[PDB]
Structure 1
Amino acid sequence: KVFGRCELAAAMKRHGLDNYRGYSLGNWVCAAKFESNFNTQATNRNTDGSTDYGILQINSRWWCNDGRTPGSRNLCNIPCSALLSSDITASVNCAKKIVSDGNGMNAWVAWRNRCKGTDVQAWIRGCRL
């Protein structure tokens, strides 16, 4: 599923992300924009053989099992395929552990490079929330 901007923000807010670990809604929507372009089915392979999945591009090295990342952890205790679903629950639940890990939203490189210190509120402007 390709979410619209406001649509995604509204699902994210329901799933309890607005100001989760102090990160306003606009951060999360900006992050999804730059990580997957709001496509739940986005996958991208890394030089190390790990793969990023879904809307928030969660990596198989640490967070999910994809059965092809040899020395990896499955910290989210979920098959990586569950992260590509049109229902964001699993992606949102795993993101909540990632962000809690100690490096905050820095764990998402598109956030760090394209959202971090920008006017993220712009990403929710206009939406009924």
Structure 2
Amino acid sequence: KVFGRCELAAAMKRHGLDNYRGYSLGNWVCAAKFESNFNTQATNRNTDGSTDYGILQINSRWWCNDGRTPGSRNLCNIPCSALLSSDITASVNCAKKIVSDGNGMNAWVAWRNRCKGTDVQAWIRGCRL
């Protein structure tokens, strides 16, 4: 599924991401825009052989099992394909664990490089929430 901007914001808010560990909702929408272009089916391979999955591009080296990243961990205890669903619950629940591990949203390279320090509230402007 390709979410609309305000449709994704509404879904992330219902699932508790607004101000989760201090990050306002616009941070999460901005991150999703630049990680996946709001597309739950996005995948991208990394140089070390691991793969990033879903609307927030969660990495199989640490967080999910895809059967093909040897020596990796599965800290969200899920198959990576669960992160490609049109239902974003799995992705949100796993992102909560990631952002909690001490590094905040710096875990997401596109957030650090394209969202951090910008007016991220513009990403939820005009939406009815």
Q: TM-score, normalising length from structure 1?
A: 1.00
d(CA) in 2 for partners of 1:76 and 1:91? Answer: 10
Structure 1 gaps of 5+ residues are none
Q: Give the 3-state SS of the residue equivalent to 1:73 in structure 2.
A: coil
| 1:100 and 2:103 are equivalent in the alignment | no
Query: How big is each residue's C-alpha offset from its partner over 1:21-58, in whole Å with a ceiling of 9 and x where there is no partner?
Result: 00000000000000000000000000000000000000
d(CA) in 2 for partners of 1:72 and 1:15? Answer: 28
Aligned-pair distance for 1:68?
Answer: 0.2
Alignment length, in residue pairs?
129
d(CA) in 2 for partners of 1:4 and 1:66? Answer: 28
Aligned-pair distance for 1:88?
Answer: 0.1
Q: Give the 3-state SS of the residue equivalent to 1:52 in structure 2.
A: strand
Q: Give the 3-state SS of the residue equivalent to 2:12 in structure 1.
A: helix
Structure 2 gaps of 5+ residues are none
Q: Give the 3-state SS of the residue equivalent to 2:126 in structure 1.
A: coil
d(CA) in 1 for partners of 2:84 and 2:69? Answer: 18
Aligned-pair distance for 1:89?
Answer: 0.1
d(CA) in 2 for partners of 1:71 and 1:10? Answer: 37
CA RMSD of aligned residues (A): 0.2
Query: How big is each residue's C-alpha offset from its partner over 1:39-80, in whole Å with a ceiling of 9 and x where there is no partner?
Result: 000000000000000000000000000000001000000000
Q: Give the 3-state SS of the residue equivalent to 1:62 in structure 2.
A: coil
Q: Give the 3-state SS of the residue equivalent to 2:44 in structure 1.
A: strand
Percent of pairs with identical residues: 100
Aligned-pair distance for 1:87?
Answer: 0.1
d(CA) in 2 for partners of 1:96 and 1:47? Answer: 25
Aligned-pair distance for 1:91?
Answer: 0.1
Q: Give the 3-state SS of the residue equivalent to 2:52 in structure 1.
A: strand
d(CA) in 2 for partners of 1:38 and 1:91? Answer: 13
